[PDB]
Curated annotation (Swiss-Prot):
Bilayer topology term: Single-pass membrane protein
Protein name as it appears in the record: Sterol 14-alpha demethylase
Substitution effect: residue 78 to F: Increases activity on norlanosterol and obtusifoliol
Signal peptide: none
Coiled coil (UniProt feature): none
Keywords carried by this UniProt record: Heme, Iron, Lipid biosynthesis, Lipid metabolism, Membrane, Metal-binding, Monooxygenase, Oxidoreductase, Steroid biosynthesis, Steroid metabolism, Sterol biosynthesis, Sterol metabolism, Transmembrane, Transmembrane helix
Primary site of residence: membrane
Keyword hit for Nucleotidyltransferase: no
Co-factor requirement: heme
């Protein structure tokens, strides 16, 4: 407009749109976009301009520019004490970038050969421990939460580390470290100034020492040559920066935390929703097609099995992520002016792009609330559940590898029944959204012949 996108009327100032938003971000966001008559628009939040990019045709405008034009650092300040100053965003873009590459090289399909069997074993344990009986009632959001942390550690943690730490203890440190997070923290740069840092630094420093000790070990076993291991930790130790330096224990600790928090809720939600959708009677044909896919697999899967021969199960997981994205907003700080469609975005704005809003556009996704694994985006790029462009998730392959394997293992040895009429409602209260906890009670039936 030789100017900014349309602005949205504030009835009660100094809050902005903070209240109807928190209740239902989706109901709210859709209202504006229609009423504004524009898929792109600014909202006020605490006197802070927030322009949401909600016309799928424009995602490229959001995801393509460099960090110097659209900076992620600022919206993500709420992460530094969980990762450490100078790690991830706190770290400067050259080194932040460097760091992500390290982690990236650890999560590549190269290192995934032992992963598919490692996952099968660790899921199969859990089932025998908690799904003991012929029939029972468990909470799926909680059981997934535990299977996810279990198999990931089984994958990315070395035997020595997993001995002197277990999944459950580490998960309890994830909860301890994270819970300092309030969603509405990222929208007042004074609130960086805790009744919770002083449990966060304790859980980190407990962890960072433990890892330090673990490193003492491996070195005084290197000349000994007892074993060969290349886990995420060991991978990061061998890490060398461009300028020949290496990661301090603190950076390394944070990166392992960052990797682990990163995947923790997102994929456990993802696994849950998928399970929820599939177990529903409205969705049997899909479960049926799911079975004609996992039916002539042997009880022990290889990397080939999940990767190249489960294409339909991939669709289910993506549709779950499409329908109910776990990260609703992705955000940047508009350091410089960027043109969006027929608008401009002024230096100083907060530009956001919402997987939640986007996945709901009717052109791109007809019946957006209908779960359809065979659906395909009808605008190209509509789906941004793993983000896009410069910042596409690096955990995508891994997340899918887990979830596909889990569904397959778990639907091979069980049936399921939702103790409800309708699939859970998304709970929009957490910074990472999943299905409502208290609705996820489900009843398993151990398959037999
Ligand atoms: C289904 C599970 C997951 C979902 C839905 C998901 C979603 C996303 C999204 C939306 C972004 C982009 C955020 C942005 O644009 O600012 C992203 C980036 C990322 N995710 Fe994930 N993620 C998942 C799993 C994981 C896992 C398992 C890891 C680690 C192994 C991980 C680590 C990352 C990293 C490092 C980025 C990089 C963003 C950047 O370049 O700064 N995620 N993910
Ligand atoms: O921690 C992450 C990333 C992530 C970035 C870097 C690294 Cl090294 C690891 C993880 C993330 C979290 C979960 C899955 N994938 C990436 N966040 C945390 C901040 N995020 C976020 C989520 C929601 C909101 C809010 F409140 F506006 F809706 C604002 C920010 C989404 C991205």
């Amino acid at each position: 407009a030789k100017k900014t996108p349309p602005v949205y009327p504030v009835t009660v100032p100094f809050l902005g749109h903070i209240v109807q938003f928190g209740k239902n971000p989706l109901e709210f966001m859709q209202r504006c976009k229609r009423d504004l008559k524009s898929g792109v628009f600014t909202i006020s939040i605490g006197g802070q301009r927030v322009t949401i990019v909600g016309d799928p045709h424009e995602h490229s405008r959001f995801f393509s520019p460099r960090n110097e034009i659209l900076s992620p650092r600022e919206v993500y300040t709420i992460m530094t004490p969980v990762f450490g100053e100078g790690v991830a965003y706190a770290a400067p873009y050259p080194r932040m970038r460097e760091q992500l590459n390290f982690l990236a090289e650890e999560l590549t399909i190269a290192k995934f050969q032992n992963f598919v069997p490692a996952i099968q074993h660790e899921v199969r344990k859990f089932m025998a421990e908690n799904w003991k009986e012929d029939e029972g009632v468990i909470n799926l959001l909680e059981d997934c939460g535990a299977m996810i942390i279990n198999t990931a550690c089984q994958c990315l943690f070395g035997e020595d580390l997993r001995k002197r730490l277990n999944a459950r203890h580490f998960a309890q440190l994830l909860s301890k470290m994270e819970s300092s997070l309030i969603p509405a923290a990222v929208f007042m740069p004074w609130l960086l100034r805790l009744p919770q840092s002083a449990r966060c630094r304790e859980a980190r420093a407990e962890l960072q020492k433990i890892l330090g000790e673990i490193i003492v070990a491996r070195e005084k076993e290197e000349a000994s040559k007892d074993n060969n291991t290349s886990d995420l930790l060991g991978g990061l130790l061998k890490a060398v920066y461009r300028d020949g330096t290496r990661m301090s224990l603190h950076e390394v600790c944070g990166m392992i935390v960052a990797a682990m928090f990163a995947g923790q809720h997102t994929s456990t939600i993802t696994t849950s929703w998928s399970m929820l959708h599939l177990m529903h009677p409205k969705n049997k044909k899909w479960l049926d097609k799911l079975h004609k896919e996992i039916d002539e697999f042997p009880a022990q899967l290889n990397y080939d099995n999940v990767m190249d021969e489960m294409p339909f199960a991939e669709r289910c997981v993506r549709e779950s992520i499409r329908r109910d994205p776990p990260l609703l907003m992705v955000m940047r700080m508009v350091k410089a002016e960027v043109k969006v469609g027929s608008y401009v975005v002024p230096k100083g704005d907060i530009i956001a792009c919402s997987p939640l809003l986007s996945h709901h556009d009717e052109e791109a996704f007809p019946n957006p609330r209908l779960w359809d694994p065979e659906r395909d985006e009808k605008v190209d790029g509509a789906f941004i559940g793993f983000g896009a462009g410069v910042h596409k998730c690096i955990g995508q392959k891994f997340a899918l590898l887990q979830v596909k394997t889990i569904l397959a293992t778990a639907f091979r040895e069980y049936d399921f029944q939702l103790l409800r009429d309708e699939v859970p409602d998304p709970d929009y209260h957490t910074m990472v959204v999943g299905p409502t906890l208290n609705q996820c009670l489900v009843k398993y039936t151990r398959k037999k012949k």
